[PDB]
Design a protein around this ligand. Structure first.
Ligand code: UDX
Ligand code: UDX
Ligand code: UDX
Ligand code: UDX
Ligand code: UDX
Lengths: 463, 463, 229
């Protein structure tokens, strides 16, 4: 029976996951470790290294009791009964599968430390949002360790995470499902049962799916791709609505009435972001190519092609509607995170849209309620340059200051705060005529028009 | 208030729809008309021209009371309050959008007939499963008619049909949504109000969507495409399962637990059929190309590409597993309809699969519980030839006669009857070794393996 | 070499096929030894010279025919390096890989058109750190060869040359055999296995090692012309 859980990786996955375990399992001790010593110190402070609604209350109530953050990875490894691995698998920027395949270097190095410091039987659980052959590389390394020293009985399991950032605590406390994969053997079934037993402290058995290792990873890979496909499908139709005088919001509403389709994840946008979806579909495309399934690869590649096309055509419409010139024009950007209720900016559509406007020599004032300032500048500099950010980018802590004197507003993240702003007062303090471009479909187009905006929105005909 | 309903078109749409209207509206007289007087006679005989579960009880229940099938089109039109148009819009086999766009020649002719014989104000409602600009052509003709003879006050509505065949009576009685589009004017809103009034005799208000005409048609066109994309998405992953040793049934089960995705319409198959999905997706592709949106057109084209690829690779695997030769081998085919619980064969996957086996000079014995023999032979002759069908095709009324002496069984339609067969008796009376290929995932592979079959199924690795 | 891929895909052994093929005196039994690809200052230059002669004689069909000899050789080198990377979970980033052999064949210091150059470059482009041992090739010759296809700086950070095969293999994740030196047969592969990272992989591009013996030592062992199962 597991009573000591360790997780290597104190990120958006590892942190929240362990916090919920400690919150729901009083008799389990949870220790989170990370190579980043400064990041662990933040987890132990009153300002956590990430923003998640409800995370502070959960962590502060468990930290020091049964939830711990340490930088002594070997000590945690040695004392664990079960060890989560939740580290990066950054995409390969060279070689085979360049720009498509994950690089497993971190997963393997952690596995070697586990082999080096386990000192006894361990259950090792790979937990990420895009697992593709990651558990197989852990098992490869661990099997050898057992082979070389039979005192180290290791069972490797696959338990991908399903949380969405911004709703992580709600998702972790009441998941639609829990997916666990392991080898079909006596020791494998026992290890799965002990992980199931942990989740059964708060997850009903009928929502826990157990299978083999590869099925678990493939199901996660396919599930993520299905979600991205819904977004790209409704986004592709948003262009049809603009061209024919229909409203994508009405089309999505009518489509969702079919219970066979479902009504969720039919919200058009400037394009999906996040560390999961693009990496996931490209990983599926790369997997299919390596299996000699070109037909399949082409099918799923369309989800990425539409996403890139949606971002590009949105930025182009901004420029075209401003008479093809934004040179030296101040433009306010509402939103930088890839979705609301998070400070995470990985693969945010705001990065690509702002870059396009920078290439037009616009001066951009960006506001986001939660994204760190240094994070925005590093993101923008890595796609352009440090100098380009210095001349063109201004970061504001107040949306009215960003809009003051601006020629245009661009909404890129669906923060609820952006709905409740005083757009009448904003219109008085902008340059005239004032334009606004809604890339998230959260604003009242008719009301903005009556205020006097030249107003535009994805999925609405520009006239 | 409407009390006299006419529908021009006594097919799979017009017939069932009118039956349900009469069944739920005792005070409304519904007359179904059709150019085919022979088809009308079948509606008036004890063998209805289509098979739909529960349809026989309902028509029979009212055939003669308030529901009638007539061949006198002018008298029915002149006496009607509301007129459904549910006729064919066959795909163009030449000229612009050849093999992609519908031919509205019949819809137009019907509108002209209505104009000639209305003799008074009428509500005209275009009702089909793939509406694309059909209602606008009706209105173009009828608006002209009104202008010329002002006595004729016409209002054209779009009311797509949401039923799925095989479950038509249940769908018509409890639809997920009723979609109605109309002109935004006093007369337009009133015309919608009276059609909404009809459906409210048995459909709750919260499932009735009212919008403008074009929004109604685009919503139906997009909803069908979303449905087809789910099937193509799961079919593409079934090849990944075959290549990597996973089971598509397990993957689909795990995917469907996400309420954002939904668990329905994830059943893999040899490929989707029916007069709707392919016609609809190709119609969307053509619409996009016309709007200068190749990007969008290409995205949705992938749904068709996968469907063709799924049929092709399934037939290719059958031949490859029989050592690349089926010359003069008897092969039993279980299923010909495009889905279960219907006699409809339009765009059935069995047509293309049987054609592939015919080109390999196989002798095929086909059994389907409901498809007319003459229907199969005409379908197969139109893609090959009457002479080819004579030499290679045998139609059986008994599945055991089809399987007797066969080298292989190929399951193409998910009829419940195929599960409950005595596969021990079938195995004993087949050639040995006996092979079986499940293109619908309805059979127990382990059980077939235990009987002694060389057994295969889409989405299961063939070893 | 082209048939060696067919063996890998269907579970046959290229050594056995070559042995059976060579028993026909009309074919002859010599020169049927599979490899990562032929090298030397002669063959590639010669076939390319023959191809060019045929093009100038307006004999393209003939030119296309002989060009296939070069195409397969390049394809054999590329797919071998790709198999190394794919078998190591598609990542060799910063992994130490030992290279056994640099000369284009055994019993010479000549490196001209050696297949080892092309294979090492592919591993360099994957950011692997390569430790090279060859019994006769000059150290300066290897470094100049590798730098001329990549860059001097790339060679400085990624290439180290050893005078002892055990030093090259010490701490390595994989062994890659590229030249058929007899010395490589009689090495102590158990001691090498103990001093490598675990699990240890070995890729035989010359078909000189005993696969069954390497497997029993505990290697993940691979060889051109043997199915990796
Ligand atoms: O060797 C390592 C590598 C990485 N890490 C740590 O692992 C953590 C990774 O967390 P991140 O927030 O970067 O990523 P997430 O936890 O959100 O993971 C998610 O996105 C990145 C993808 O590669 C993962 O597959 C996915 O689960 C970092 O804090 C990093 O410091 C180690 O502790 N050791
Ligand atoms: O309807 C929608 C839904 C989502 N999106 C966008 O798509 C992106 C992803 O949004 P999600 O809510 O899925 O957030 P995440 O990317 O964190 O979660 C996703 O990846 C990790 C998996 O474990 C989750 O199950 C999956 O939802 C965001 O950029 C969001 O703005 C839309 O544009 N429209
Ligand atoms: O001018 C005409 C043409 C055709 N018809 C009749 O209308 C009936 C059409 O019924 P079908 O079963 O062929 O078609 P459905 O009712 O299933 O309609 C469905 O498939 C065909 C597509 O064109 C439609 O868009 C779709 O809704 C036929 O019986 C035909 O004889 C007329 O009454 N008048
Ligand atoms: O999970 C599935 C679902 C369906 N299918 C196949 O897809 C094809 C379509 O079957 P449907 O159940 O959609 O039947 P229909 O085509 O008659 O109905 C469809 O078109 C008319 C619309 O009004 C309906 O809403 C739509 O479902 C069938 O061949 C079926 O076998 C699958 O292969 N897998
Ligand atoms: O069976 C074999 C034989 C040779 N090879 C390779 O082919 C390449 C050539 O080796 P050789 O033994 O032909 O050596 P050389 O290239 O020096 O001689 C060759 O070119 C010069 C001519 O004069 C010689 O007659 C010719 O043999 C080497 O890379 C060798 O490893 C194989 O891969 N398999």
């Amino acid at each position: 029976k597991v009573s000591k859980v360790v997780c290597v990786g104190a990120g958006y996955v590892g942190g929240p996951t362990c916090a919920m375990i400690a919150h729901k399992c009083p008799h389990i001790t949870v220790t989170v470790v990370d190579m980043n010593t400064a990041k662990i110190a933040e987890w132990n402070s009153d300002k956590l290294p990430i923003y998640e609604p409800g995370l502070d209350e959960i962590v502060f109530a468990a930290r020091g009791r049964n939830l711990f953050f340490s930088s002594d990875i070997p000590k945690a490894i040695a004392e664990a009964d079960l060890i989560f691995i939740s580290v990066n698998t950054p995409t390969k920027m060279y070689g085979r599968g360049k720009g498509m395949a994950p690089d497993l270097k971190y997963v393997e190095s952690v596995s070697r430390t586990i082999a080096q410091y386990a000192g006894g039987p361990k259950i090792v659980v790979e937990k990420s949002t895009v697992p593709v052959k990651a558990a197989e590389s852990i098992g490869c390394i661990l099997r050898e360790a057992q082979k070389n020293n039979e005192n180290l009985k290791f069972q490797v399991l696959s338990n991908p995470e399903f949380l969405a950032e911004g709703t992580a605590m709600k998702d972790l406390a009441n998941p639609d499902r829990v997916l666990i994969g392991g080898e079909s053997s006596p020791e494998g079934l026992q290890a799965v049962a002990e992980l199931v037993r942990i989740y059964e402290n708060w997850v009903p058995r009928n929502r826990i799916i157990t299978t083999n290792t590869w099925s678990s990873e493939l199901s996660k890979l396919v599930a993520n791709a299905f979600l991205a496909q819904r977004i790209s499908s409704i986004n592709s139709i948003s262009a049809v609505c603009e061209a024919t005088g229909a409203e994508i919001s009405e089309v999505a509403h009518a489509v969702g009435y079919d219970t066979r389709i479902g009504s969720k994840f039919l919200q058009a946008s400037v394009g999906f972001g996040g560390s999961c979806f693009q990496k996931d579909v490209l990983s599926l495309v790369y997997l299919c190519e390596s299996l000699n399934l070109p037909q399949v690869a082409d099918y799923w590649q369309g989800v990425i092609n539409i996403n890139n096309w949606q971002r590009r055509r949105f930025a182009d419409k901004i420029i075209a509607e401003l008479f093809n010139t934004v040179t030296d024009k101040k433009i306010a950007i509402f939103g930088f995170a890839f979705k609301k209720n998070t400070g995470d900016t990985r693969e945010s559509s705001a990065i690509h849209v702002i870059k396009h406007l920078m290439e037009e020599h616009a001066k951009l004032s960006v506001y986001d309620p939660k994204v760190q300032k240094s994070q925005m500048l590093n993101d923008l500099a890595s796609v352009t340059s440090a100098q380009d950010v210095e001349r063109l980018i201004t970061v504001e802590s107040d949306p009215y200051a960003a809009a003051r004197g601006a020629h245009a507003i661009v909404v890129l993240t669906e923060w609820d705060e952006f709905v409740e702003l005083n757009y009448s007062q904003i219109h008085n303090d902008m340059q005239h005529p004032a334009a606004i471009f809604d890339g998230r479909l959260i604003l009242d187009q008719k009301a903005l028009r009556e205020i006097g905006f030249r107003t535009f929105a994805i999925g609405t005909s520009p006239d």
